[PDB]
Amino acid sequence: QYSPNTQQGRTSIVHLFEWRWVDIALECERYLAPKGFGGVQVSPPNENVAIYNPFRPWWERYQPVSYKLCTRSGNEDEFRNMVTRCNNVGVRIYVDAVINHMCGNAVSAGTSSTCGSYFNPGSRDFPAVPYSGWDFNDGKCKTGSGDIENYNDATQVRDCRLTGLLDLALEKDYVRSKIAEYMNHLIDIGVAGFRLDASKHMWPGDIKAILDKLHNLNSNWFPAGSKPFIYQEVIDLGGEPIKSSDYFGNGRVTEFKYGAKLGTVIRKWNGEKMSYLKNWGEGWGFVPSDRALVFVDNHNNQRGHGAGGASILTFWDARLYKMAVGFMLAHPYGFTRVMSSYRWPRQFQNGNDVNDWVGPPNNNGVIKEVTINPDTTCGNDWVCEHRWRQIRNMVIFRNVVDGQPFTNWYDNGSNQVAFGRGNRGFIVFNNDDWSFSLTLQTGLPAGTYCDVISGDKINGNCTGIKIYVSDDGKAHFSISNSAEDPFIAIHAESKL
């Protein structure tokens, strides 16, 4: 469960949030595979409630109506096609599995679903699965509202409705079996793993019982005995009765303290400084590295919808975001997930974005295609952070230094730090309000290296900054606080 099942040498996955299956298939072949990306986390592929008030919000996809592979992203044939083409190129697909609940209990009965399936929340009827009143925790929940009212009671957090969402009775074999049927369908199609949505709202033991029903990965692409990669979304900051360690026996867990603390440090909130990142990782109270799925932002906290709050860095904070992603991608702790989003009309009112519900770029509800510009950036409002040179090059940096130890740490006692990864890579950051100019020990073999943040290595030459490492491994670095990107990164494969 703990191994990503990525191709040897690929160390990150990217969340292609709300992308269509045909767009992902093309991206796998034209960019992800050649650029060395390990895999793609896709949006929930199962049928969901079509919500028109507000107009097709991104969160309607977290309200299942059935397990049919029929959504705004495409149909079952398009999904299968995408998994096949991506696998044939070495890029894995990870499915966002929404198995804790069905749709909101107050949603109107009818066929307002992405596949026309009929459902009736009020009477607990979802014929397309099928599920009935007997398959929900209505009688198990002990709160007066039937919803989760207090997170200090670990029992209601698991048996009651997360903000009205009908809660599946995951202790029942029938329900466990319907969910396994769905997941095994995806596994046999070729998916390498899953993100278990709302894992905090499920009992570790119920989750385990489901995973015990799962097939090994498709033997046409994966070695015999391969188990699906499992990462559970569990928001565990401080002081809750539920701990993310309770879920270590099922697979990895999302470490939400990672992006929250990286955000406060890089923003320099409340006296925090980059020099404190010396012992980043478990030393900061994070889960063990081999059980961590890390990221700077995710789809639900980049819009103020989740763990981290206002400290979270996103593409909106382009300069600081690149630096945070760079640090994450250079640092050995955990398995990294890169975010890929779409722009929406942010509208802050009283400190809150009232347009945080807006779904993906679309035409009358039909998701727009991802168009690629001549400079490799995307159009149609897709941000495509995974295509930003600084980010894309750091994804490669992580691949090149995979397995190398964390060494040669340097810091000025403030916000100017540097460190290397064995003798395969070196990275330098300047987040102080003054310039950095110093000769550092890089642990790298002598030679001329291209800085992969400012440029690229293109046919025996660098398009950006060049760094010269001496016989003793020392090298001079100059970064002004006015630089577009206040950090420099060089590695074995950017060497001239």
* Annotated binding-site members: 100, 158, 167, 195, 201, 298, 337
Residues annotated in the binding site for chloride, as ranges?
A: 195, 298, 337
Nearer to Cl ion, 162 or 427 (CB): 162
Catalytic residue among 197, 236, 272, 297: 197
Binding Ca ion by CB under 5 A: which of 167, 236, 385, 451?
A: 167
Q: Which does 303 bind (CB under 5 to 8 A by kind): Cl ion, Ca ion, none?
A: none
Nearer to Ca ion, 174 or 348 (CB): 174
Shortest Cβ 241–Cl ion spacing (Å): 21
Q: Which does 233 bind (CB under 5 to 8 A by kind): Cl ion, Ca ion, none?
A: Cl ion
Within 252-271, which residues bind Cl ion (CB under 5 A)? 254
Site string for Ca ion, 145-164 (x = CB under 5 A): -------------x------
Q: Which segment (124-132, 166-174, 250-258, 316-324) binds Ca ion by CB under 5 A?
A: 166-174
Nearer to Cl ion, 243 or 305 (CB): 305
Nearer to Cl ion, 100 or 254 (CB): 254
Within 196-255, which residues bind Cl ion (CB under 5 A)? 233, 254
**Cβ atoms of 364 and 47 closer than 8 Å:** no
Shortest Cβ 146–Cl ion spacing (Å): 26
Shortest Cβ 233–Cl ion spacing (Å): 4
- Establish if 298 lies at the interface with Cl ion (CB under 5 A): yes
Is 493 annotated as catalytic?
no
Q: Which segment (24-32, 92-100, 289-297, 311-319) binds Ca ion by CB under 5 A?
A: 92-100
Q: Which does 167 bind (CB under 5 to 8 A by kind): Ca ion, Cl ion, none?
A: Ca ion
Nearer to Cl ion, 63 or 254 (CB): 254
Nearer to Cl ion, 259 or 420 (CB): 259
Shortest Cβ 35–Ca ion spacing (Å): 38
Count the site residues for Ca ion by CB under 5 A. Answer: 4
Residues annotated in the binding site for Ca(2+), as ranges?
A: 100, 158, 167, 201
Does a cis peptide bond (omega within 30 degrees of 0) precede residue 288?
A: no
Catalytic residue among 233, 385, 432, 485: 233
Q: Which does 298 bind (CB under 5 to 8 A by kind): Ca ion, Cl ion, none?
A: Cl ion
Nearer to Cl ion, 41 or 442 (CB): 41
Shortest Cβ 248–Cl ion spacing (Å): 17
- Establish if 201 lies at the interface with Ca ion (CB under 5 A): yes
Question: According to the 3-state scheme, what is the secondary structure of the chain?
Answer: CCCCCCCCCCCEEEEECCCCHHHHHHHHHHHHCCCCCCEEEECCCCCEECCCCCCCCHHHHHCECCCCCCECCECHHHHHHHHHHHHCCCCEEEEEECCCEEEECCCCCECCECCCCCEEHHHCEECCCCECHHHECCCCCCCCCCECCCCCCHHHHHHCEHHHEEEECCCCHHHHHHHHHHHHHHHHHCCCEEEECCHHHCCHHHHHHHHCCCCCCCCCCCCCCCCCEEEECCCCCCCCCCCHHHHCCCCEEECHHHHHHHHHHHCCHHHCCHHHHHHCCHHHCCCCHHHEEECCCCCCCCCCCCCCHHHCCCHHHHHHHHHHHHHHHHCCCCEEEEEECECCCCCEECCEECCCCCCCCEECCEECCCCECCCCCECCCECCHHHCHHHHHHHHHHHHHCCCCEEEEEECCCCEEEEEECCCEEEEEECCCCCEEEEEECCCCCEEEECCCCCCECCCCECCCEEEECCCCEEEEEECCCCCCCEEEEEHHHEC
Q: Which does 201 bind (CB under 5 to 8 A by kind): Ca ion, Cl ion, none?
A: Ca ion
CA angle, 383 then 386 then 388, to 5°? 75
Q: Which does 254 bind (CB under 5 to 8 A by kind): Ca ion, Cl ion, none?
A: Cl ion
- Establish if 96 lies at the interface with Cl ion (CB under 5 A): no
Shortest Cβ 368–Ca ion spacing (Å): 34
Shortest Cβ 154–Ca ion spacing (Å): 11
Shortest Cβ 175–Ca ion spacing (Å): 11
Residue with tokens 């949006």: 43
CA angle, 157 then 163 then 168, to 5°? 60
For 39-73, b where at least 16 C-beta lie within 10 A, e where not — what string? Answer: bbbbbbbbbbbbbeeeebbbbbbbbbbbbbbbbbb
Nearer to Ca ion, 48 or 100 (CB): 100
Q: Which does 60 bind (CB under 5 to 8 A by kind): Cl ion, Ca ion, none?
A: none
Instruction: Report how far apart the first and last C-alpha atoms of the chain are (Å, whole number).
Output: 40
Q: Which does 47 bind (CB under 5 to 8 A by kind): Ca ion, Cl ion, none?
A: none
CA 182, 185, 186, 188 torsion: positive or negative? positive
Is 255 annotated as catalytic?
no
Report the catalytic residues: 197, 233
Applying CB under 5 A, which residues contact Cl ion? 233, 254, 298
Applying CB under 5 A, which residues contact Ca ion? 100, 158, 167, 201
